[PDB]
Amino acid sequence: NKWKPLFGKNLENANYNPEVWSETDGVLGAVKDESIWTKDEYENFELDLDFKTDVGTNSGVVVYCTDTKDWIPNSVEIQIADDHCEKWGNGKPYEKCGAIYGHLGAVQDKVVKKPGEWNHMRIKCAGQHIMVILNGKKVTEMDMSKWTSGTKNPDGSDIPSWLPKPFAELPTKGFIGLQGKHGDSLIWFRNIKIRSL
């Protein structure tokens, strides 16, 4: 159908703490670690958002969340990361920007721009099929039905112990959220919007 702001105007359609999450000059950011969620559940949608990184940014967009309190194992996370910072060495493919965190790498990295440059990401969530388009590049295409294991990924890498639920049996409807600030690297969001497929 048509695009609408994911959180409405003035975050009216979001569940959040206003001491954590706020809009400044049209740009959403967080000063503490707690997440921001939609008040409503979504399936069969495309989500657009702009984001800007800091050096070493590690964040993510959460979709299909069936529990906003115990969200980590009951959701899918599209990784947002500063691929130009190499802190943990080479890193894992599922830690790169536009990956499905813990589950599936992006096909190329350093599609994300350098810290302080604006990025654009579109996430198409069509039941078990998730596509990530980053800066106009199709970087990630997951079919969740392949994830029959909660411990091992189709690419052979181990799934972090804190993500035990097989993605093949995960529901493909739930809340959408953004993650808060966990350390010194900031992240900024804008033009966060959604429409149905």
User: What is the binding site for Na ion (CB under 5 A)?
Assistant: 58, 60, 79
Question: How far is it, in rounded angstroms, from Cα 1 to Cα 90?
Answer: 41
> Considering beta carbons, is residue 40 or 158 the nearer one to Na ion?
158
CB of 3 to Na ion, least distance (A): 25
> Considering beta carbons, is residue 68 or 79 the nearer one to Na ion?
79
CB of 2 to Na ion, least distance (A): 30
Residues 55, 46, 82: CA angle, nearest 5 degrees: 10
Closest residue to Na ion, based on beta-carbon distance: 60
CB of 179 to Na ion, least distance (A): 7
Query: How many C-alpha atoms does 84 have within 13 Å on its Cβ side?
Result: 11
Query: How many C-alpha atoms does 20 have within 13 Å on its Cβ side?
Result: 15
Question: How far is it, in rounded angstroms, from Cα 64 to Cα 124?
Answer: 12
CB of 140 to Na ion, least distance (A): 14
> Considering beta carbons, is residue 38 or 59 the nearer one to Na ion?
59
Neighbours of 182 (CB within 10 A): 11
> Considering beta carbons, is residue 45 or 101 the nearer one to Na ion?
101
